Design a protein around this ligand. Structure first.
Ligand SMILES: CCCOc1ccc(S(=O)(=O)N2CCN(C)CC2)cc1-c1nc(CC)c(Br)c(=O)[nH]1
Length: 297
């Protein structure tokens, strides 16, 4: 049984699991290993002790989230959610963002990262499934929160999940970039705090684009596989982007995606914390590789 095995396992250290690395890859990990990494994330962010999470309940919640991801989705599945969460962890620790945030905000971000694609690119994200699982018998990892803490946390979770809509990122990013440019960025400002949390969610969600080349190349295959599947479904129920016949367009699309969407974000995030530079560096390196491919075409 998955639950018995998970609950009984020793949770290795964050160092052993490499989850502090921006360059982290999940390719060689089993599902069990991704669950243990996830436990280590909650544990090393001081969320387990601080909020009186029962070990068995945390284990069951992780398994419930994992099993509620559809298996026939090539990219937006448990592994992407898990990677989003790992990137959050790395940003908080290696990126030194943890000291900028409260415990409830960290709790909410980690849960949102893990849960944000449950109701699965300008796709809409929903938090209904996330909440249902959190309220499920035996899965109530927030039961240890006071009423006031609980209300605060749910609000942040909802906003964080919604933030992963790229349409909302595009709508709100100009204000973020300008606050930064005009040296007006101030996390003590509740509006700006909320804005920053949304941008951090996007940064983590898009983080495959920053990985070492062999890793980005493979994730890009999954993304293309999902796009083409959706094209096929739209036919039975298609642009070039979602057309398996226009695959030689992928390098050029990836350069476009980096230039239009990703680069400014990791530039802005680096301005907020220099220790997040490796995300920016990785994204720059991947553009150069995709461009070289777009020209050999
Ligand atoms: C790899 C297969 C191609 O993948 C893409 C193709 C096109 C675009 S686009 O719509 O931004 N495109 C270029 C910019 N443009 C001006 C509009 C047209 C995005 C991606 C892309 N999305 C994600 C987020 C799911 C990840 Br992750 C990723 O790696 N790739």
């Amino acid at each position: 049984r998955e639950l018995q095995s998970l609950a009984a396992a020793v949770v290795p250290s964050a160092q052993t699991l490499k989850i502090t690395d921006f360059s982290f890859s999940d390719f060689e990990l089993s599902d069990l290993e991704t669950a243990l990494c996830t436990i280590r994330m909650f544990t090393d962010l001081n969320l387990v002790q601080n909020f009186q999470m029962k070990h068995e309940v945390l284990c069951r919640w992780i398994l419930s989230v994992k099993k509620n991801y559809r298996k026939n989705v090539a990219y937006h599945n448990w592994r992407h959610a898990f990677n989003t969460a790992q990137c959050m962890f790395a940003a908080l620790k290696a990126g030194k963002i943890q000291n900028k945030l409260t415990d409830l905000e960290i709790l909410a971000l980690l849960i949102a990262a893990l849960s944000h694609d449950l109701d699965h690119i300008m796709e809409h994200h929903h938090f209904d499934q996330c909440l249902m699982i959190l309220n499920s018998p035996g899965n109530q990892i927030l039961s240890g929160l006071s009423i006031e803490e609980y209300k605060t946390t749910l609000k942040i979770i909802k906003q964080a999940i919604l933030a992963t809509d790229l349409a909302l990122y595009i709508k709100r990013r100009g204000e973020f970039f300008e606050l930064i440019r005009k040296n007006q960025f101030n996390l003590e400002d509740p509006h700006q705090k909320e804005l920053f949390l949304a941008m951090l969610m996007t940064a983590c969600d898009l983080s495959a684009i920053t990985k070492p080349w062999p890793i980005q190349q493979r994730i890009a295959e999954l993304v293309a596989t999902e796009f083409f599947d959706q094209g096929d479904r739209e036919r039975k129920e298609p642009t070039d982007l979602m057309n398996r016949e226009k695959k030689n367009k992928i390098p050029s699309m990836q350069v476009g995606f980096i230039d239009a969407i990703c680069l400014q974000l990791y530039e802005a995030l680096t301005h907020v914390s220099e220790d997040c530079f490796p995300l920016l560096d990785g994204c720059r390196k991947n553009r150069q590789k995709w461009q070289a491919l777009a020209e050999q075409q």
